[PDB]
Amino acid sequence: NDVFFFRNRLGFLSGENIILSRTAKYFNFYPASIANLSDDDPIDVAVSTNRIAILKYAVPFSEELLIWSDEAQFVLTASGTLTSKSVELNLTTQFDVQDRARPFGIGRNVYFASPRSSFTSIHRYYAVQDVSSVKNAEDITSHVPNYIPNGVFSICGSGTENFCSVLSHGDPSKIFMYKFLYLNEELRQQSWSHWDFGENVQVLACQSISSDMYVILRNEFNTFLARISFTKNAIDLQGEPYRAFMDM
Amino acid sequence: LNTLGDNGALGQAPYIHLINRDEHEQYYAVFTGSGIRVFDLSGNEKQVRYPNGSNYIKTANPRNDLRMVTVADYTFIVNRNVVAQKNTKSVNLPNYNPNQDGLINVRGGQYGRELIVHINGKDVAKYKIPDGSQPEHVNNTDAQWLAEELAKQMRTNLSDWTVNVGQGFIHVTAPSGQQIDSFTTKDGYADQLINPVTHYAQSFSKLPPNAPNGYMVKIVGDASKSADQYYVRYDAERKVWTETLGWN
Amino acid sequence: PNGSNYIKTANPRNDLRMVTVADYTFIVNRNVVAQKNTKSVNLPNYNPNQDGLINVRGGQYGRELIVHINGKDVAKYKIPDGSQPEHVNNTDAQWLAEELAKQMRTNLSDWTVNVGQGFIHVTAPSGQQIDSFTTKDGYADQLINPVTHYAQSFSKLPPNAPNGYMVKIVGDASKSADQYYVRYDAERKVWTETLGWNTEDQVLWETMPHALVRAADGNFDFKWLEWSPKSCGDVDTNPWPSFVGSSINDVFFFRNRLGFLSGENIILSRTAKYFNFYPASIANLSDDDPIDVAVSTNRIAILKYAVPFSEELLIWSDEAQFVLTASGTLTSKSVELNLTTQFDVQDRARPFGIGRNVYFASPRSSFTSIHRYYAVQDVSSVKNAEDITSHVPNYIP
Q: Disulfide bonds, which pairs (chain A)?
């Protein structure tokens, strides 16, 4: 299902099994010597839970690696250093994540899409402040329960512009945006506007680079790459009299 | 910035990933589901050759199947629909009978010892080392002469088997049709005078001192240190026993 | 002295980085890429095949000494019995060696054969090499023994040897180890340990960092700092350090070891010496060894800066912040390099920590936003960055 690099070792998530490589080499999966056990050896832990949870995604979060699965979230960790015996793979939380969309972590939080039957609900995975290791997921769409249509293919965002945008295959034209701001640790702003680019403009996955977001659109005559940059004071094109808020 | 071709150029549902490796190496990569079309952020197509095949990319629904993880050294594309498999075609020692090709290491002689080596239950070779006239016998107590003497008797008794002498070893190779069922040899002294050696050794220390260029022995456990039984292969050039990958 | 080109750069705010520690000040150009010198090699042209040795140790009556090189039984000397006084003189190893040598010299005119205390050294002419060195003792391997440049164990090492005989001690398949190279010294009669037989031992000093040092006079000198050679070990066992093919972004001292941040790799030195990057002994793992951890994350984050914060070292990167830590003490295996937070830091400016907090610049498109990195009070290890310019969003250019 997915490829991750835990520690110095390439890792794969296949079914309910996490397979890691020898530490030095990402390609070699087998022990260097069968005769002598080495800490630098492949690992074949299998997730341990009473339900069936195939491991779809691996997300780095906090100071841990969280191996998410459709119905559950797990932490890959070790008792001390990593051997083929030390690794534990515990089961932190049981929130449901739809897996067409990779979870995106803007800052401390990791944002993911949960699929209700008609409209998706985006959630935020955070480490709860008081307890030593309890992670919880707030639902950030509780105020807009039926806004984002069900197909969600991308969750993309910018720390610099403090925003998360979810592109949904359901309503192709819109890029649904959440703008947030944390003062102290409180959430001062929760906003869920949508940006609509055109009547028939199917929007492929935008991905911000710095403060500039590169969007790919359909027409449906010809597809294009365009740029959105949040520059306060700039004239987007040369010689233009004033920034003209005109699309394309 | 640019137009990236017709509506279907990128496909109905492309998986598009941004490879932000460097300031100058910012590229977008789209998976049409029929191929890979990479675009510079200025909109310029960058040719993707597909040496070594292109079928992995081909998928009906590439938003959902191809997953791309980008690490600084390499970018990995994983199709989730595809299932990993082993090649039955490439095998080590593909057809291998441990039974054939056994070796006997003659190391010494002493007066009055009957050298009896029996293969397949018939005492094939019977050479009694003799005493009573010392100068001829000191010449006779030597291992090398004993080996050649044993070999010639063995060749007559085993016409099909090919017997080849060595520095200390006597290598008995069965014809393909036949195999060595019993390799027991009676030294007439402790196991020291001569020793039957099979492809299994209780310990690395109990390994034949000299051997053919490829003799493989499986070092079974000494039942002292916990270990996984391992396979060791001799190299004549370097005179080192090393370690290997198994026999079938 | 020793060159000035390292400093020369078009944009020095961005390329030269200077880290000042009390003993030395290190200047790192990030544009420059570290490289190895093909020029300096150990045993630059080396065939293991040539120069094999046979150690004659004893004789016994009735044994045929047959030594065959290249498939012809070159030397055939039958030790004899039947008249004891002459034979006791004959059972001796040294005479046998010289006897074997002379036969060998006639049979191998081009090969040069030189006797030794117990060894017989066969050296092939440059054109030819020793394909087969097998010798038949006529007794156990004890009477005489062919010795190649590979030994299954240190114990299985020729007792006497030429002044430079190098043997690679392959594993005994008992203790896990890295096969190591051992070189004999005739003066001291000790086998010791060495650096390989065709391996480049040195990095090019120019490309690697340089230092500014106050002199006697008090006027500074800009010179390269010598980096230790790969004293022991072959290329496979002793891999070239990660920076050897790439640029070093920054220099840090974690624990007692100098460290470099190159690309997505953190390379540390042996604990005692800041310059030496390779293990002291390939044969024995030591906790005091270099470390080559690579940051583990699903995105591309080249590691630009290392900032000491709290009781941890935070290795910052442009899009992410990582903590360098170890499970217990530091070995090459213990270090973890986790991924605390994913805030964006522009890297022309080194983060500065006034007190508990570390302040950094994040680049929005038009105006920078300075942020403060603090350890959140309530949780055990959660670090967060407040934006201190939220009230003045567009002030700092």
A: none
